[PDB]
Every structure is written in structure tokens, then in C-alpha cells.
Amino acid sequence: VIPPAVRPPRLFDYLKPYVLKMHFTNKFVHAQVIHSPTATVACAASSQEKALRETMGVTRDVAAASKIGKILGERLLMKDIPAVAIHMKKEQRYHGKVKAVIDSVREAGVKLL
Amino acid sequence: IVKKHDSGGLIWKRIKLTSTRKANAKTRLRRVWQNEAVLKACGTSDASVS
Amino acid sequence: AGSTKNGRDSKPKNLGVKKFGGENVIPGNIIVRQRGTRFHPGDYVGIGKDHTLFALKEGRVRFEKNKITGRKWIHVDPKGGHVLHPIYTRAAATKSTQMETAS
Amino acid sequence: QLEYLPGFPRPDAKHAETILAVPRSDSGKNISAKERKAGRVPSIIFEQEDGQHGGNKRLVSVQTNQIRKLVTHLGYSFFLSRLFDVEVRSEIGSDEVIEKVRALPRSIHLHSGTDAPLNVTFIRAPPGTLLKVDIPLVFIGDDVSPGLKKGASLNTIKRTVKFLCPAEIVPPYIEVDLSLLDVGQKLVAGDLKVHPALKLIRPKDEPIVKIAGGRV
Amino acid sequence: KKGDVLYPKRTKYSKYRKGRCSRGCKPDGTKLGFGRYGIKSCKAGRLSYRAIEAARRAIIGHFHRAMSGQFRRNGKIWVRVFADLPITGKPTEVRMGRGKGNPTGWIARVSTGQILFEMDGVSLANARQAATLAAHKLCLSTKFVQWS
RNA sequence: AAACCGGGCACUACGGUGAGACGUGAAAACACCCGAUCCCAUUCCGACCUCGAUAUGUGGAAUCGUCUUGCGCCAUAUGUACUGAGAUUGUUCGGGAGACAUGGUCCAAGCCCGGUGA
RNA sequence: AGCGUAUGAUGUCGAUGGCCCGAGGUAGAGCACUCAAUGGGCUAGGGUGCUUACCAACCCCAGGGAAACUCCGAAUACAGGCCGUUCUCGUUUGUACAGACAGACUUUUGGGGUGCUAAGAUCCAAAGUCGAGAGGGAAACAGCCCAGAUCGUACGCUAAGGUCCCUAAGCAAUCACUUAGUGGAAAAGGAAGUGAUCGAGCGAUGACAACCAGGAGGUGGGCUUGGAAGCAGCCAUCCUUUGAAGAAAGCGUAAUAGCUCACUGGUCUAGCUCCAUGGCACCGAAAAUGUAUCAGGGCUCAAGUGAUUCACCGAAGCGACGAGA
RNA sequence: GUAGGCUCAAGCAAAUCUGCUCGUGAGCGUAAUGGUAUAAGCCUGCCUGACUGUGAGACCGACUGGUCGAACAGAGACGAA
Ligand SMILES: [K+]
Ligand SMILES: [K+]
Ligand SMILES: [Mg+2]
Ligand SMILES: [Mg+2]
Ligand SMILES: [Mg+2]
Ligand SMILES: [Mg+2]
Ligand SMILES: [Mg+2]
Ligand SMILES: [Mg+2]
Ligand SMILES: [Mg+2]
Ligand SMILES: [Mg+2]
Ligand SMILES: [Mg+2]
Ligand SMILES: [Mg+2]
Ligand SMILES: [Mg+2]
Ligand SMILES: [Mg+2]
Ligand SMILES: [Mg+2]
Ligand SMILES: [Mg+2]
Ligand SMILES: [Mg+2]
Ligand SMILES: [Mg+2]
Ligand SMILES: [Mg+2]
Ligand SMILES: [Mg+2]
Ligand SMILES: [Mg+2]
Ligand SMILES: [Mg+2]
Ligand SMILES: [Mg+2]
Ligand SMILES: [Mg+2]
Ligand SMILES: [Mg+2]
Ligand SMILES: [Mg+2]
Ligand SMILES: [Mg+2]
Ligand SMILES: [Mg+2]
Ligand SMILES: [Mg+2]
Ligand SMILES: [Mg+2]
Ligand SMILES: [Mg+2]
Ligand SMILES: [Mg+2]
Ligand SMILES: [Mg+2]
Ligand SMILES: [Mg+2]
Ligand SMILES: [Mg+2]
Ligand SMILES: [Mg+2]
């Protein structure tokens, strides 16, 4: 079948302008928080960064995803962003690296919307 | 106008298109053509001081 | 003797659009009464169990059409604009006021 | 090398008339009916280049008698596959030449019941312009063919073939020789003898004509 | 098909609207699709399938008689008009309303300019004579068409 | 630093979706090549997905570019169909398709991370 | 419920138009789905005697019908916001009093269904008139055209419709057409009168019509066949000499014979024949008390038809003067 | 009801799987129409919100009456959320 175009969820009562999106490659893990009204990155954490690619041994596994999630949660609380909304792609489930990033963000003290 | 002339028992006679009827139609056409010319000339802009 | 076996029809249902594009709505106003999703719900539009579309916020009806598939959505553009989630107004907006009054 | 090759048909000198046109101030059914009541066919002269924004279009009217005579004498398909000189004057018999152009008649609308001309369309074709033209086919050699001497019948599948043509060497027709055709086998569009600068638009495996088996 | 008389083998519905037939043309003009000669209509109207088959039989018989030997069978006809609309009727001594009547025949709706027959494999004179012979079976005004 | 390159998000049918041909793996990136111990995948199966593992192999599959095109899509005729008002039993004034036909597949363009330039 | 009245109380309306803006799936069109359906190209295959004028699925090309099909798709209409015009409350609502719930006809059968594309039929949509509306026109006339009667006048201007008489006002003006009383009932089809325009073909190289002379040879083509010889039928339909002549277009013969035509030369001399678009005429055209299908006279020496033009007549419409509420 | 997972029908190649075309033509108990693809279809686990009392605001409309519904209180089901 022809795949339908993916739409953001429809607004019901409130805006919720901060959206968390995750990306994983063969070498690095990524996590971007997007400000939807301006299409700008409010906060981002990845193991490809110059300050982070040497402070951890493995930059591609589940442990790296957990570390990047904790770093992103601390950075989000530093920018006074109390809560984010989770966006999963077509192939992403609540398992493995996605689960590690989500659990580390929630454990850092950021509410999930 | 009634256009039923060859059916039924109620006679609606066919009004012949005479030259006098054509003259009246031409007069009505001249009136509507002058009205249309006035509307074309005046339709380019609106009057001010509203 | 002749007899027709066709004499039935059903009562009218009065389906269709009640609020066209640009019309003002208040919460609870029915926008479309339909069978199935002839129009899909958009932002600030609810959908009922008989696929009735109703406004969730005060605002104006706006129609959207997908150019590729032909699917149509109906949105309400809210009168006072978007309202942030209360967790952002309690914390992020107070820090926003602090950042504004420090500037 | 932009000349008709030897041994190929050229446009005839007898039908090389100049089409006379006068300008037309508007478009629509109203002015078209008023022009046809005055004995003129509404028309348009345009070009390929800016198809959006009109084609540098000029609205004209041509005489009904000249168009009817040309379509009757040439034929419908032969009229649409032959270049013409179009002269635009300020009025009929004047001297203020507004445009003198060599144009192809792109389309002509004849009335479905009375076959009176309702619209003629001319596209500007200066040298070096490539036009999609439907060239009619002339079938010769049917009195010499072995297939039709035996009593079989001719299935003429196509009467026109579409070609992309430079404007200089648009053939008025393509002669199809049937003389080496006995019963059963067929000619395709690749078998047509054309100038090398003409390109088939449809695939070469399109059957043109076929001698089908006569009933024993 | 069904040999001579042409109507559908089946229809989705048995009883149709009357419809309107006095209007309708071909807005782009008409050209022959299969043959070199043809018959087109000049008016808009209704033709019964029996009249269409009578005209076809007249063309076929004229080609069968005027040509002999090997060119007798070389004349080919195309029938471009098809009676696919059923008509109904009611018997005598029957009052006006107890439902629609039983189907009684088939008609074809014809527009102005619509091509009715096409001919190939014959001479121009025989095509003209077959067109004249076929026109007398039809209740609509027709015209002889030549490919050009 | 200001441009360029890679990836992620965003924009979007002139920007979509196919086909063919030619290239490209920058000291970097993406993917594949390899495995199935734990998580996960299989109503059988590392086929898919997942978790692992790659001083440098490959761009065969995908992913990037360039052209050629097919459908679409956008723009635009001319004429006709149809139609609103009006009865010279529609001699007028307006609207105007579908199918044709002609061109185009633009221009502009945001944020973050990494690399080269530095 | 909708629609009438009276009397209160509220809105700033109601009505109508402009601009902006919104969803459409009808008319039309088209085949991309469904149904209905035409011709061809390829070949599976079936079946015949390697072969198979026999049919041949699936694809491909051409083609293109539908109220209960839609790749498309109007004009109108409708909803909403704002702003003009009307200065009228005709709007909403309280209270009190109703009547009415049998409708008719006309708008191309060009909004449709049913009926027979019948009905002064019947049933819905959208207008109008009658109902409940007089006046002028349509001979006479509920429903068509024009137009809304408070009253008076022996004043004026107009609408529809008229201007030879009947009958108020033109034997009106200019340019064309018809000679059928067409106008002033009736189709397919026939005939080709009379104009307008554009073609086509032939033509002093002599065309058309007319008169004169030839119209041949292989050949009696082969078959068929009692005979078929140009001419019952089948197949061939070539060639030659020619100025020209068909293996013959008519007739005619049992078959031959014979007489013409196509074709050609001579004489004569100026244009001749058919194609297209549309103009106006002719035939097709028979009912019953009495002409009886311009109302009648009569009209072509238009008072008929097409186009252009000027005056006038014409209503209870509108004005003037006088009078009411 | 919910959470998770999955994607039909038809055609073609190999000749039931595996793939490629294609697009709503499958399914959704039951007529027809409209709708529908990370579903409204199919499979699995647990459940019983197939609750109690209400309801801003609308859609139908002679009236009787019918329909959709954000949201509130209580008691729950499923879900990492
Ligand atoms: K379940
Ligand atoms: K609750
Ligand atoms: Mg009577
Ligand atoms: Mg009467
Ligand atoms: Mg006169
Ligand atoms: Mg007058
Ligand atoms: Mg226009
Ligand atoms: Mg168009
Ligand atoms: Mg239609
Ligand atoms: Mg059609
Ligand atoms: Mg339809
Ligand atoms: Mg409005
Ligand atoms: Mg009653
Ligand atoms: Mg009643
Ligand atoms: Mg009634
Ligand atoms: Mg009507
Ligand atoms: Mg009716
Ligand atoms: Mg009737
Ligand atoms: Mg009646
Ligand atoms: Mg009655
Ligand atoms: Mg009414
Ligand atoms: Mg009464
Ligand atoms: Mg009244
Ligand atoms: Mg009256
Ligand atoms: Mg009277
Ligand atoms: Mg009267
Ligand atoms: Mg009054
Ligand atoms: Mg008098
Ligand atoms: Mg008469
Ligand atoms: Mg007559
Ligand atoms: Mg008598
Ligand atoms: Mg006067
Ligand atoms: Mg008076
Ligand atoms: Mg008065
Ligand atoms: Mg007074
Ligand atoms: Mg799910």
C-alpha cells in the first residue's frame, strides 16, 4: 500500500511546543528537542559532539543512549524547559536505545507530555 | 409568453412578429444599450466623499 | 392487476456542512454532520461517534485540502491564539518574565 | 542541410496562397458569432516559446471563403500538415501590414453537423522551430501488390502518423508503397521513408497497414 | 451482438428514465475513426435498434449486390451507434398509475454530428449510394462523410 | 569567518511519484558487508526488526548527485458544450468548461550537530 | 407550524446590492472505476489436414455510451464577515381575533418523474398571472403581453399593440426579396422557379447544344454450354492499329444479325455544365348545418418578407388643474 | 474496552512462500451509501467504561420527541508513559 504522509498530532486544548526526536546511526546516538512554532532546535545532545565523543567509550550502544538522555535532561532543566513531548518515527518502539533515551530524560526530571 | 398554439381547446393565438413589434423591440434594445453604456463608463471608479 | 413493490424511502437526515470556511464558532458548535470522515478533524476540532465534527475552541472555521491525496481537514483558528500548556505557563513563562525584566 | 531531399514530396505551388487576416478586439462566443455573421472565422496567432502567458498571442479573423476553399481543396489532414504565409492588415484591402509570418495551422474547428469553419489556429513557425505534426499517409501501389491481386483486402490501420518535425521540411504527405506486400504481413511506422531530421513520437512497432487474409 | 438486432445482453437496471434527447452535439467536431466513408447525423434524436439494423442491412445488401466475386466481401462496415436504452410501454385498457410498464424495445440517443456508420473497401460512388439507401430507414437527417 | 560538504528536523507537488543511462563514498558523515550471547524479531527462520561488533573493505541493495523522459502537477490559450438575466416564439448583455493545443518542473529558502576550510 | 389583523414591548433591524471568502459534484464532458459495448494487432491455446482463408484467452492500439458510473467539471444558487442604498418596522416577541389546509394556467418535452418526448393528464422544482385585479392589446378571451382603478375634467405624454377601410393614427421614407393570396395551418420526400456569394471543370488551342461521318483489329478472349459470338452466368479485362473506339454502356436476337452510347474528326460560334453556403417561393395537403386556417373587406399598381429610419395613435400607467381621507 | 504488533484484494515472475506491479478493487455480522491502511481491518495479552449522577454548547423540529458533545464528581480497566 502507499504509505500515508505522517502528520503531527492535532491540537486539542494546549500547544505543547517542545518535541523530542531521536536518531541513531551505526556510530552515534542523537536526541533533538524541537521548538515547533519556530522550527528551531531548543536543545540537543549527541555523542558526536566534540565535548562528548571523548568523555564516553562507546558512542553507539544503549549505554551511550542513556548517557545522552541524561545529558539532554540536565540541559533541558538548565534552559528552564520543564516538559517535552515524545515523537517516535515509523520504526521506533519503546525498546532499546529509544527506551534508554526516554527513561534517562524522565529520570533527569523532565516530564513527558 | 405562451407558446402552445396547436393543442387543446383553449385558444392562445400566435402573436405574429410584425414590423411594428420589431420597432418596439428595437426601441427597448436602444434603451438597454444606452443603460449598459452608462454603466460601462461609470464603472471604472467609485464616487468619493462617502 | 398491477402492483408496485417500490413505495419506500427513509426520513431525511439533514447531513452536510453547518459552518463554512470563515464562519465564527464557539465551543460545542457542530461544523459537519456526515457519514464517515468526508472531512477529517484538524486543530481544535473534535469528532463524535457518528463522525460529527464539532469545535473545541472559540474561533473561525478553516478548511485544508491535501494536494496529493485529496484528503480534507477542518481546523478552528482560535480567537486569542494558541494557549501554552499550564506546565509551561507555571515555570517557563515565569522564567520568561524574569528574563524580560532582567532585560 | 535543411532542405527537402530529392525524391520526396514537397508542398504544392497551387495551394500556396497567402492567408489574409485582420485584427480582432476581443474573445468569446459573442464576438465570434458577430464575426461569423460578418463572414469571418475567429482566429489566433501564437508561438511555442512562452506557453504560459499566452504565447505572444495575436487575435485575428480570417475570411470564411478562403478557409473553406483551402480545407475543401487540400483536405482536412493536408491543411494541418503544411506551412502557410499569413498576412495581417489593418482592414480588408488596406496597406498597413501588422504582421507577415510563416505559420502552421495548428488546429481548425469545423461544426459537427454543417462542417462550417468556426475557429482556425495558427502557430508561428520561423526556421528552426520543431513542431509535432500529424502527417497524412498516401497509399500507392495497391494495383501492383500481389496480396490484393489475389482477392485479399486492405486493413488501413493508420491514416496519419505523428512526427516531430523541423518547420522547413514538414512533408505534406508520406507516400506508402504497398507493392511488395503479399497476403499476411504488415508495415509498421519504422518502415516509412522520411527525412533523417524527423523523429517518430510513437513507438516504431506501431502497425500502419496490413493485408488480411481473403475469404476462400 | 445477437446477430442482427443490437441491444445489451443484460443491464444493471431494467427500467430507465425517459431523458431528454432533442439537444446535444459534438463540441469539438467529428472525424471518422475506422473507415474512409461514413454517415453522420445532422440532428439530435432517438433511433430504434430495428431502424439501425434496417440501415445496416441496406448497406450490406447494396455492397453484396453492386460488387461481385472477390471485391463483394472486401466492403467492410462499422456500426458506431448502439441501442442500449430500453423503452417501456403500457397496454390498452390500462389506467394511468400502477407503476412503470413492461419494456417494449431499445433505442439509441443520437447527438448532432454523431457518426452512425463507417465504410471502407468500396468505391466512393458505392459509398454514396449506400449512404442514400441507409438514410431512408432513419427518422433523423443524415449526411455523407468522407475522410480528408 | 564566510562559503562548501554530511546527517537530523523544517519547507514543498513547477518542489510529487516512476523508468533508463552516467557518475559519486570527501583524512568526515550515511548505509551495507560480519555475528546472534543478553534485550528484541519469527503463528518456522537475524528474511524484517533488534542488540552487538567494523585503523578502513564496498556503494552490488538502498542513500546521494547529473542528465533524458513517463504519469501527474502548475500556468495559459483559441473555439465549442453548457449556463445567469432578458421573450423580436430568446436577433441582447454576461459567466464559461471537459477534451485539445502551448510551455514549465522554477525562483526563494530556516535551525542544530559534525567535517573541511580555519 | 407557515401565511392575515389589532394593540403593546424590544432590536437596529428587515429588504436589496457591492467586496471578500467557503463546501460542492448538477449541466456538460470523459472512460481513470463499475456496468454496457466496436474494430484491429499480437500470440497463448483449442481443434484440421510440418501445416492449418477456422475460431483464439491475456496484454497492446484505435474508439468512447450510463438516473442509481466519475480521471474531470461549470453557470447559477446557498452560508458567513464587512460596507453601501432604502427611513420604510414591512424585523423579533407578548397579548387578543382569525381565515385557510379542493387550487388553475403559462414559461420549446430546453428543470425533471409517470404517460405515448399524448392530453385543457398527473406528480414535484423555480418564476409569473389568476384566485382576490378593473383598464389597453391578443377578433371574441380567468391564467398570455402591457399595466395596478380614492374622486372630477370635451387638458397633456406614453406602454403593449398599431397607423388603406372596418378602426384612433402613414395609399409613410430608403435599399433589397416573393408573385405562392405564400403571407393567412401541416412532415419525410420530390421538383428545381427565382435571386446573393464562393468555388469546380471545360473553353477561340473552338467548348456546350445542333447537323454530318466513323465507332475498328487479335476475337467467336477462356470457361459455361442445346446455343451463347460486346451484351443468361463465372473468370480474365489485356494488347494493337489508330483521329478515335469499353473484351462493351444501352437496347435488341434462340444464338448470330442489326441499331445506338462512351470516344473521335468535320461544320458552326460564345460562353457552357455542376459544387458549397445560407434568402424567398412550389407539390406532398381528404370530413361531415355554411365560405369557415388574415375577424371581414380587400391587398402584389403591397396593405406581403428582410434591414434601416421618422412622425403619430394608443391604458383607469404618469403628468396638469380641482377635491377628499 | 485497552496496550502492543501486523497489512489486505488482484495481477505477473519463478510455478505454496519469496519478490515486483498496482491502489481500495479485501475486510469491517447483517441492505445500500459514505468512510477507512502504524486503521474503523487482522493477531495476541489483560479486562468489563455494554459504569453511577450530571452536562457548556450546538444539530434536527408543528408538538410529542430524537442526535452529537467539550467538561465535572465518584468508582474502575488497560498502558512505561
Ligand atoms: K483484544
Ligand atoms: K471520570
Ligand atoms: Mg374551445
Ligand atoms: Mg384565446
Ligand atoms: Mg415593411
Ligand atoms: Mg413603440
Ligand atoms: Mg471570456
Ligand atoms: Mg482547460
Ligand atoms: Mg449528461
Ligand atoms: Mg462523448
Ligand atoms: Mg453524473
Ligand atoms: Mg452576503
Ligand atoms: Mg385536508
Ligand atoms: Mg390539499
Ligand atoms: Mg396540490
Ligand atoms: Mg417549467
Ligand atoms: Mg410532465
Ligand atoms: Mg402537459
Ligand atoms: Mg391540470
Ligand atoms: Mg385534476
Ligand atoms: Mg408558485
Ligand atoms: Mg375561492
Ligand atoms: Mg393579486
Ligand atoms: Mg385583467
Ligand atoms: Mg376587447
Ligand atoms: Mg384582457
Ligand atoms: Mg391604487
Ligand atoms: Mg381613421
Ligand atoms: Mg395560406
Ligand atoms: Mg411546408
Ligand atoms: Mg363545405
Ligand atoms: Mg403622442
Ligand atoms: Mg387617458
Ligand atoms: Mg394611478
Ligand atoms: Mg392634487
Ligand atoms: Mg495499535
Side-chain angles (χ1 to χ4, degrees), chain D residues 36 41 76 107-112 115-121, chain E residues 26-31:
Chain D
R36 285 191 212 95
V41 186
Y76 174 81
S107 69
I108 174 159
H109 183 194
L110 307 174
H111 188 275
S112 61
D115 290 286
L118 303 181
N119 185 50
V120 192
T121 284
Chain E
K26 299 284 186 178
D28 313 305
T30 58
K31 297 298 169 291

Side-chain angles (χ1 to χ4, degrees), chain D residues 64-209:
Chain D
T64 304
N65 287 337
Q66 183 170 14
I67 291 301
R68 193 189 289 276
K69 149 194 184 193
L70 283 174
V71 169
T72 293
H73 286 69
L74 277 79
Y76 174 81
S77 313
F78 300 87
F79 181 71
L80 298 183
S81 69
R82 177 216 184 94
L83 275 293
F84 276 95
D85 276 317
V86 185
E87 179 175 358
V88 182
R89 292 183 175 182
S90 63
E91 57 93 24
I92 307 162
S94 182
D95 61 87
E96 289 94 337
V97 168
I98 317 186
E99 176 169 339
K100 180 71 167 65
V101 69
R102 185 67 179 269
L104 179 77
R106 168 86 278 165
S107 69
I108 174 159
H109 183 194
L110 307 174
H111 188 275
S112 61
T114 68
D115 290 286
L118 303 181
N119 185 50
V120 192
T121 284
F122 294 105
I123 179 161
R124 286 177 188 106
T129 48
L130 282 74
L131 319 163
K132 329 183 187 179
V133 189
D134 284 321
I135 295 92
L137 301 186
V138 171
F139 294 93
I140 60 174
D142 47 355
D143 48 353
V144 186
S145 177
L148 305 187
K149 286 191 295 177
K150 294 164 202 158
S153 59
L154 195 72
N155 180 14
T156 305
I157 313 175
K158 288 186 182 294
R159 274 79 184 263
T160 55
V161 188
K162 199 176 290 292
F163 278 90
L164 180 73
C165 311
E168 301 89 6
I169 50 163
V170 179
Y173 54 93
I174 288 159
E175 274 151 340
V176 191
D177 198 0
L178 303 174
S179 292
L180 310 177
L181 269 176
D182 46 340
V183 191
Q185 78 269 25
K186 64 161 174 300
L187 292 168
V188 289
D191 296 347
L192 300 179
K193 291 187 179 186
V194 291
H195 200 286
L198 269 75
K199 321 217 206 182
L200 267 167
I201 298 183
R202 297 257 281 203
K204 274 79 180 171
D205 200 36
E206 291 298 321
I208 295 306
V209 74

Side-chain angles (χ1 to χ4, degrees), chain B residues 37-43 45-50:
Chain B
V38 169
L39 291 163
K40 183 182 285 186
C42 284
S45 56
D46 290 331
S48 63
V49 185
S50 66

Side-chain angles (χ1 to χ4, degrees), chain D residues 29-77:
Chain D
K29 54 168 185 158
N30 173 46
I31 194 163
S32 313
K34 291 194 193 303
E35 286 298 272
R36 285 191 212 95
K37 187 173 70 75
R40 292 184 293 278
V41 186
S43 294
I44 180 179
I45 300 173
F46 74 107
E47 76 203 356
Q48 280 183 348
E49 201 270 336
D50 211 11
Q52 67 277 37
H53 314 97
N56 194 36
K57 65 179 168 189
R58 173 178 323 261
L59 298 174
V60 288
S61 294
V62 288
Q63 298 288 131
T64 304
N65 287 337
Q66 183 170 14
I67 291 301
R68 193 189 289 276
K69 149 194 184 193
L70 283 174
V71 169
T72 293
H73 286 69
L74 277 79
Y76 174 81
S77 313

Side-chain angles (χ1 to χ4, degrees), chain E residues 63-96:
Chain E
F63 285 165
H64 181 82
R65 283 187 321 268
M67 288 172 172
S68 290
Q70 297 164 336
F71 313 124
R72 181 203 311 269
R73 59 185 66 94
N74 281 5
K76 191 174 179 66
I77 191 178
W78 293 268
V79 193
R80 305 287 307 280
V81 61
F82 182 73
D84 46 0
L85 318 173
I87 53 178
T88 76
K90 290 201 302 192
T92 318
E93 287 95 359
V94 164
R95 294 175 183 168
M96 269 297 105

